[PDB]
Amino acid sequence: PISPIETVPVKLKPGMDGPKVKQWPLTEEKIKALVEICTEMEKEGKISKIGPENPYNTPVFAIKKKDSTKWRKLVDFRELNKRTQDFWEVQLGIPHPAGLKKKKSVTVLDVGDAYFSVPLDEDFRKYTAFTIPSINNETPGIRYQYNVLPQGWKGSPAIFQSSMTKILEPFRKQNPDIVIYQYMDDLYVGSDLEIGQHRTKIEELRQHLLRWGLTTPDKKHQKEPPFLWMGYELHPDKWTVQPIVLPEKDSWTVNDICKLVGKLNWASQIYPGIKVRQLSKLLRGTKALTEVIPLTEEAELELAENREILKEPVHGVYYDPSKDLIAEIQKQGQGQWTYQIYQEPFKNLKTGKYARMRGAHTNDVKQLTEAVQKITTESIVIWGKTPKFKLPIQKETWETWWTEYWQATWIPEWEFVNTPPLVKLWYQLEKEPIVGAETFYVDGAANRETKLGKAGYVTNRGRQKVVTLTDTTNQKTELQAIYLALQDSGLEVNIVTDSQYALGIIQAQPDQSESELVNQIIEQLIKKEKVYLAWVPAHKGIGGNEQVDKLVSAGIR
Amino acid sequence: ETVPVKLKPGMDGPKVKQWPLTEEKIKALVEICTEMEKEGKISKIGPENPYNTPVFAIKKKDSTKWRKLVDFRELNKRTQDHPAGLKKKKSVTVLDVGDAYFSVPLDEDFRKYTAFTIPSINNETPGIRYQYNVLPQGWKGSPAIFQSSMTKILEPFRKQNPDIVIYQYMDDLYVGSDLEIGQHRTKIEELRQHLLRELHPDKWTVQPIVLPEKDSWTVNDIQKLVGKLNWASQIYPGIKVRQLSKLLRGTKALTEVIPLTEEAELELAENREILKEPVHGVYYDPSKDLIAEIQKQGQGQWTYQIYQEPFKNLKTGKYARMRGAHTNDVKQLTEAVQKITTESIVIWGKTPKFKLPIQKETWETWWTEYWQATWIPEWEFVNTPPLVKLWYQL
DNA sequence: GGACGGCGCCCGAACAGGGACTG
DNA sequence: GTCCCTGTTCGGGCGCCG
Ligand SMILES: Cc1cn([C@H]2C=C[C@@H](COP(=O)(O)OP(=O)(O)OP(=O)(O)O)O2)c(=O)[nH]c1=O
Ligand SMILES: [Mg+2]
Numbered sequence: 001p002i003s004p005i006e007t008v009p010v011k012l013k014p015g016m017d018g019p020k021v022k023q024w025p026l027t028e029e030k031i032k033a034l035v036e037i038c039t040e041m042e043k044e045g046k047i048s049k050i051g052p053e054n055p056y057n058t059p060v061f062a063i064k065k066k067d068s069t070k071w072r073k074l075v076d077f078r079e080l081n082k083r084t085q086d087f088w089e090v091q092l093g094i095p096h097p098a099g100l101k102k103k104k105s106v107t108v109l110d111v112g113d114a115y116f117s118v119p120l121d122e123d124f125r126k127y128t129a130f131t132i133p134s135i136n137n138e139t140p141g142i143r144y145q146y147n148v149l150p151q152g153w154k155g156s157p158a159i160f161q162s163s164m165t166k167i168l169e170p171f172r173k174q175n176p177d178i179v180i181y182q183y184m185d186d187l188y189v190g191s192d193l194e195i196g197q198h199r200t201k202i203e204e205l206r207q208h209l210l211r212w213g214l215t216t217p218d219k220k221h222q223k224e225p226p227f228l229w230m231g232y233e234l235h236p237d238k239w240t241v242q243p244i245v246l247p248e249k250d251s252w253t254v255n256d257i258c259k260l261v262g263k264l265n266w267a268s269q270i271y272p273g274i275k276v277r278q279l280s281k282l283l284r285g286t287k288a289l290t291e292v293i294p295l296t297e298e299a300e301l302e303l304a305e306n307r308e309i310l311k312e313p314v315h316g317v318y319y320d321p322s323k324d325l326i327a328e329i330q331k332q333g334q335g336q337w338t339y340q341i342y343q344e345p346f347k348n349l350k351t352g353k354y355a356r357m358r359g360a361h362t363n364d365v366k367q368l369t370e371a372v373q374k375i376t377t378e379s380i381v382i383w384g385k386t387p388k389f390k391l392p393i394q395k396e397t398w399e400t401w402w403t404e405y406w407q408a409t410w411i412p413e414w415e416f417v418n419t420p421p422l423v424k425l426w427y428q429l430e431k432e433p434i435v436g437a438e439t440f441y442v443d444g445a446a447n448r449e450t451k452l453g454k455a456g457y458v459t460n461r462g463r464q465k466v467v468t469l470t471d472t473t474n475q476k477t478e479l480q481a482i483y484l485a486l487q488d489s490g491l492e493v494n495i496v497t498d499s500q501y502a503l504g505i506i507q508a509q510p511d512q513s514e515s516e517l518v519n520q521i522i523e524q525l526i527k528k529e530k531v532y533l534a535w536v537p538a539h540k541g542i543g544g545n546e547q548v549d550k551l552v553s554a555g556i557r
Numbered sequence: 558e559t560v561p562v563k564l565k566p567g568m569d570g571p572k573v574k575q576w577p578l579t580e581e582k583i584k585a586l587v588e589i590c591t592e593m594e595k596e597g598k599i600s601k602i603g604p605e606n607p608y609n610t611p612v613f614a615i616k617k618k619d620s621t622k623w624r625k626l627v628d629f630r631e632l633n634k635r636t637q638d639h640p641a642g643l644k645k646k647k648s649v650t651v652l653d654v655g656d657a658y659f660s661v662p663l664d665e666d667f668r669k670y671t672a673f674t675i676p677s678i679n680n681e682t683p684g685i686r687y688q689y690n691v692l693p694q695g696w697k698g699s700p701a702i703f704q705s706s707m708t709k710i711l712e713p714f715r716k717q718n719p720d721i722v723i724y725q726y727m728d729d730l731y732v733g734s735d736l737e738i739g740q741h742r743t744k745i746e747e748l749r750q751h752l753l754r755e756l757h758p759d760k761w762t763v764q765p766i767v768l769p770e771k772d773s774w775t776v777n778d779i780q781k782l783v784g785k786l787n788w789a790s791q792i793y794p795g796i797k798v799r800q801l802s803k804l805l806r807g808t809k810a811l812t813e814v815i816p817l818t819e820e821a822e823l824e825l826a827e828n829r830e831i832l833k834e835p836v837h838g839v840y841y842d843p844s845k846d847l848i849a850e851i852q853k854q855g856q857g858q859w860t861y862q863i864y865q866e867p868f869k870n871l872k873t874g875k876y877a878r879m880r881g882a883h884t885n886d887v888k889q890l891t892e893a894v895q896k897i898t899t900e901s902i903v904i905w906g907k908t909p910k911f912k913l914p915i916q917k918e919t920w921e922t923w924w925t926e927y928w929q930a931t932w933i934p935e936w937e938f939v940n941t942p943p944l945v946k947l948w949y950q951l
Numbered sequence: 952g953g954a955c956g957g958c959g960c961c962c963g964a965a966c967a968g969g970g971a972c973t974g
Numbered sequence: 975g976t977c978c979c980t981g982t983t984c985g986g987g988c989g990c991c992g
């Protein structure tokens with residue numbers, strides 16, 4: 001039947017008209033499927049034959065469903081979608097099994113022909129004109145418009161989600177302590193009732209929906225565990241993901257890689273240890289989906305470890321609100337991290353991975369802080385509160401970093417976990433100049449026209465060095481000068497620079513950079529015992545800065 | 558009967574995505590919106606309204622009630638378009654009179670622009686959308702349109718106390734007097750009784766640039782000092798670094814001890830005096846935004862400058878909690894931002910655009926757990942160069 | 952095969968600043 | 975102004991769901 005709910009008014013974008021697009025040729029099988037669907041829908045008033053007063057048309061096709069018996073009628077409304085008003089999407093996210101609470105009784109059920117039960121605004125119906133091509137030479141082709149929501153229109157998901165929320169509002173008010181997770185037309189229904197009373201309430205709900213025109217065919221009314229829901233299997237006390245099949249190709253294209261990375265990201269929600277850094281880097285600067293990229297050895301090994309991880313059996317548990325939420329973070333290399341969220345020690349609620357590279361230069365404490373942030377907003381979405389953390393970082397390390405760092409940074413209630421690799425700072429700049437360490441005055445200059453430059457230093461003990469550079473920049477010459485002072489100094493060095501660029505980088509204590517030259521600097525800094533970095537304004541005649549400025553400006557400025 | 562309101566020409570409405578809320582806030586918002594709907598103040602809407610403004614809730618300190626807070630910053634940016642004696646009163650209290658706005662209808666053609674969406678835990682349901690039927694709290698136009706009724710309600714209290722200063726900024730009455738705090742609180746309760754129908758701005762102080770005192774100076778010390786004065790000369794053209802810099806000719810070790818000449822000693826005392834005088838030639842322009850910059854100084858100290866053009870500071874200040882065994886940088890930054898906004902509202906009746914020395918993500922993750930005001934200033938995030946931190950250091 | 956919306960991830964393109972240059 | 979360097983946003987693939 002068709003819902004007696006009020007329609008949602010919609011409009012074309014201003015100054016625009018309905019689509020005029022030729023039906024394309026479909027196979028005969030799809031034409032029979034469409035014909036059966038269409039004459040049945042026409043009998044039920046879901047579609048209406050139209051005449052030549054309607055000038056519009058847009059192509060139509062069909063695909064098999066999850067149930068491979070039944071067909072699904074679709075409409076390529078890409079034109080009309082372009083010309084249709086904007087909507088505000090109401091589906092803000094995706095429900096997650098780890099957020100479900102234990103329930104005495106559970107039912108999953110699906111609405112039959114969901115879209116085709118929700119009326120479409122009358123004023124807009126004419127733009128949905130479509131044509132079923134002739135199945136014969138002796139039979140011509142019927143033209144229809146839609147009276148209900150069509151699949152392929154950009155307004156259908158939101159209008160259906162909103163209509164469903166309205167339809168379920170009365171039942172929810174009357175039944176506040178029965179929980180109905182509503183994913184488009186999938187309903188997970190949970191109660192704390194004994195199975196009999198629960199089934200009675202479910203019948204109430206089915207009849208409530210039927211009064212509003214939505215059927216719940218028994219074919220999709222799951223009554224016994226394990227429940228199949230949102231890509232998972234729900235058992236009474238544990239959940240799992242429906243199995244992941246990684247491809248086993250020998251030649252790999254960009255598209256093959258995107259498929260692999262997508263399935264691994266899906267799997268990491270419950271499998272600990274998934275890593276995609278190398279596989280993902282493989283996609284850099286690629287041309288198009290067809291480009292074959294050859295696996296690096298690093299990516300080869302990564303994929304091997306992931307395949308092994310996937311051969312293991314794993315599950316999640318449901319949420320108990322009367323216990324704390326605990327997230328535990330584990331480091332892997334390359335700015336990669338995994339996490340486990342749980343309430344009792346070896347019973348994960350879920351797992352995950354953080355790997356995103358933020359910024360040209362960074363270190364492991366920064367990365368850990370942003371992994372904490374990601375997990376915190378994920379926890380607020382799924383459980384509505386913040387978890388308690390267990391991090392591989394010593395309280396003194398955090399303390400030191402939060403002292404030395406000029407930015408506001410913070411991490412909620414947490415506790416040190418002694419599972420290496422521990423997060424550390426790999427060097428520490430001095431706060432005061434160092435007695436007995438030689439003092440270097442460094443500078444660089446670069447000619448913006450020819451891109452030739454010079455880096456170099458003078459020391460208070462009389463050493464002087466100038467190094468010439470080709471195809472460089474001012475910022476790069478400054479970095480090279482600092483690198484040179486580090487190479488030629490002892491285990492303890494005072495360095496003076498005029499470049500607040502270089503000072504801002506080095507002061508934030510990076511241990512990774514996408515710049516080779518900053519990596520080389522970082523390596524040097526780890527080899528040292530004491531480094532002190534002072535700043536002076538450039539071009540003011542100050543101290544040793546003047547001598548080195550005159551040295552490096554010589555053939556370049 | 559309603560007052561028509563339009564948007565600034567060539568501007569569509571707000572389209573800001575709602576951010577995730579904790580369970581406490583969602584429950585509060587759902588109950589508050591339920592009541593608001595029974596009373597006709599808001600109406601459910603669908604997805605055919607394409608506009609959206611985020612929403613959240615604050616539980617005020619030791620108050621068992623919550624308060625909804627709509628983040629109307631974008632809408633206010635897009636809506637069509639001061640008592641100088643308030644900054645001087647001995648004491649000033651701030652009342653929340655947003656409630657009044659629910660008594661005035663809102664122009665129908667405008668209502669769609671106030672859409673907002675309640676989210677759900679673990680995405681159990683699609684979001685649930687509302688729009689306003691009355692003057693919304695935190696909207697630029699609510700005080701503008703209610704102004705006349707406000708003046709009418711306040712005329713007698715202002716007559717019977719012409720020594721009390723009352724100022725309205727959007728959801729807030731600022732009430733200032735020169736009374737003993739007991740009599741001041743009694744007068745405030747008089748005003749709250751009449752309305753059924755603690756700040757001390759005279760003690761806010763300026764944080765001046767300040768130079769080190771030493772009996773022994775190293776090359777390092779003098780290099781830091783010359784850099785700091787070179788910077789400060791852009792705010793004070795009196796500053797000069799000729800002689801102090803002269804002390805550094807050659808290529809010296811950073812820890813070599815340098816004796817200060819007579820000339821350099823004079824220059825240093827002069828500069829020390831120049832930094833006493835206030836910044837000359839800085840006039841507040843209301844048609845430009847106030848810029849606030851904050852620098853974390855460590856150990857619970859924070860420094861701030863309010864200016865409108867670079868180096869022309871209207872005010873400079875510091876906020877200083879006590880050193881932290883269990884200190885929270887984000888909570889402190891939020892407190893600093895609310896204090897500074899309060900001061901800017903009192904002095905100039907306008908909020909600053911803040912440049913915040915924090916990551917976008919950290920701030921957005923946590924700031925609403927410490928917000929306690931009914932307005933929200935505009936902000937952007939920066940990666941501060943620790944130079945300026947050294948410059949304004951105390 | 953292919954149409955739609957949601958969230959996730961990852962990369963690159965097109966911006967938006969702020970600092971340092973040339974004579 | 976210009977060139978550099980760095981940050982954010984958005985759009986395009988894919989995963990998953992209906
Ligand atoms: C899976 C899917 C779905 N939809 C829309 C339409 C129906 C609702 C619900 O999907 P569905 O339950 O599988 O199809 P439905 O039309 O209800 O048909 P049946 O449930 O009766 O088989 O989402 C879509 O537009 N494209 C899709 O690929
Ligand atoms: Mg269905």
Ligand SMILES: [Mg+2]
Nearest residue numbers: 443444498538
């Ligand atoms: Mg230089």
